[PDB]
Design a protein around this ligand. Structure first.
Ligand code: CL
Ligand code: CL
Ligand code: CL
Ligand code: CL
Ligand code: NI
Ligand code: NI
Lengths: 353, 354
């Protein structure tokens, strides 16, 4: 089945010797790794990297990212001896913990200089006790900083949320004016078509590019839009009022083509997909009420004036019209350069000496 | 997050564990293991106080809703000698049942509690050689796994089958009519199912299809698709339709008994399969498509049992449906289930007696 690597954790591999002096980066699982990746890309340039993870579900994925590290090993089991053997074999120059892997033996029984990034405070007793054990803490909010400072942590700063860093890609150019609806589920399709139908009464040249959450549904989606009375086409072919995308990936590259984006997983009870993507391009994003899985991101976008929650077909029409008549300025990308810059600055300085 | 990792509790187990002394200690890493062991736990819970531990923070909230099946709840202690021994000293458990695997070295090496591994399989790895012999009793899925573990010098290793194959039926519903039941169906599965059912109705004109979407948000859509096929439609409780859509969450497992044949989705689209087992517990055959890669043990069990049929296209689906409609297939999954359960429960009770 899956590889738990229990022996490796308990008795870290001898070959760690071959990675001595590296910068040790710990990403509990795939999420943490992706969140830290933009920082890792830069650090990887000035340091050899020793990468560890906790979840067995992350091994296979991380193996595909060998470009971003020199050595890969699971985190040692949390006893003084496994942890000390890990540190003694690898003699790491420092350890960066992404988000909050409060492993007591790891934190208590290693001597490696320790750095926590993207942390937030909960006010719990384990925080009171272990926070002071880090040489440097970078938090998401100045509020979190305050709490940790009352915990006797020195060297604590706020740099913002690493999750809000833009990772854009090349992108695509298309002539025409478009709305781009991405990661749309079957149960979201009709409300969007009915909204776009109401809109086209006014904006006759406007086209909808529609990208299903599952590209397999590209044909069911087409037939629906056809049933609604739209001329339709499949991407590459831009002839339709509703343009369906059937090729995987591509979605993040399509956003720059539009004036307004709509992101699914939000009009049905899914919890929201990736709201950030379109806004990194200076485009406002509209979403439905079901954002519980991306709540921090939601509150961030609303504060940045870049995200807009709509409750129903009517609100959607109303919001779309507002954004088509008045171009909403978006500054998410500058914030992104700012968070990234702050994190990378403090880390480079800390690592310098 | 907003999730509780309970690090402090794992590191320094709660003093109140005292008030649970002499209990049977059952460890279920997360929700899946708990549900897998639940039928056995229900019986053991009658004869033992239960101290229940879990590893995944994601299980805590769920497990709190299961307070009827345990006496004490606490996360597994962190894997260092001191936390583990403190857990053990506080709770003085009579024994520890580990569900499936959870080879936590310090836990296994530094506790004196008699330890029992349940529903295990053998990967043949070095950590297995080393830790397997530290269990007082090991109950495995196959006689093949037993042989491997036997060669690691494990004594007291048996096979009682896969706990995951234990039926958990529920009350069940009754309706007048003849039905086929398609459950956990995704949008991309609706057309091969409707195409096949249209062909079948030519011959069995009285047959009705109860259609339960994977996600109810897709029901309106499903109903409209049925209409395009020219079926009379209706929403559950109304049995008017040739195709009857189901609009309520849950419900599915209680519906199966109503049918002559079940179809279970996540299988005609590359999803990997939903719960093939449930219909067969009613002595009803189940049909699925080729994409069962997330339920492959279950798929293999059903095939050997003569209760599960893989179909690759609309024709084989029509073919298999017609076969099962013309000659009723005998299904003995429930029989197998009582067997697996009784075996596990027999061995456990005997170990715990003395
Ligand atoms: Cl201590
Ligand atoms: Cl001590
Ligand atoms: Cl302790
Ligand atoms: Cl102790
Ligand atoms: Ni998916
Ligand atoms: Ni779901």
């Amino acid at each position: 089945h899956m590889q738990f690597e229990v022996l490796k954790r308990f008795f870290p591999k001898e070959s760690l010797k071959n990675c001595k002096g590296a910068l040790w980066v710990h990403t509990a699982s795939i999420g943490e790794f992706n969140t830290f990746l933009p920082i890792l890309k830069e650090l990887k340039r000035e340091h050899r990297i020793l990468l560890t993870y906790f979840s067995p579900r992350a091994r296979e994925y991380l193996k595909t990212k060998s470009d971003f590290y020199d050595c890969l090993h699971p985190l040692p089991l949390d006893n003084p001896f496994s942890v000390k053997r890990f540190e003694e074999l690898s003699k790491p120059k420092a350890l960066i913990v992404v988000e909050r892997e409060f492993w007591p033996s790891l934190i208590i029984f290693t001597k490696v200089p320790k750095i926590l990034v993207n942390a937030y405070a909960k006010g719990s007793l384990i925080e009171k006790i272990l926070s002071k054990k880090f040489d440097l803490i970078i938090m998401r909010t100045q509020e979190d900083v305050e709490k940790f400072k009352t915990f006797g942590a020195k060297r604590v700063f706020s740099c913002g949320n690493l999750k809000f860093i833009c990772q854009k890609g090349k992108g695509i150019k298309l002539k025409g004016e478009f709305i781009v609806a991405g990661s749309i589920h079957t149960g979201e399709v009709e409300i969007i078509l009915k909204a776009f139908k109401e809109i086209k009464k006014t904006y006759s040249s406007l086209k909808l590019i529609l990208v299903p959450r599952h590209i397999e549904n590209a044909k069911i989606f087409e037939k629906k839009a056809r049933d609604f009375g739209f001329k339709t086409s499949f991407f590459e072919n831009l002839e339709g009022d509703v343009i369906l995308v059937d090729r995987f990936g591509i979605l993040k590259e399509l956003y720059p083509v539009g004036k307004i984006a709509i992101v699914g997983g939000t009009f049905v009870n899914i919890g929201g997909h990736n709201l950030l993507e379109p806004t990194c391009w200076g485009i406002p994003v509209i979403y439905g009420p079901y954002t519980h899985k991306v709540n921090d991101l939601k509150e961030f976008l609303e504060k940045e004036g870049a995200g807009f929650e709509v409750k129903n077909e009517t609100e959607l029409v109303t919001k779309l019209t507002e954004l088509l008549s008045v171009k909403k300025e978006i500054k998410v990308e500058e914030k992104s350069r700012e968070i990234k810059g702050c994190y990378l600055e403090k880390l480079r300085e800390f690592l310098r000496g």
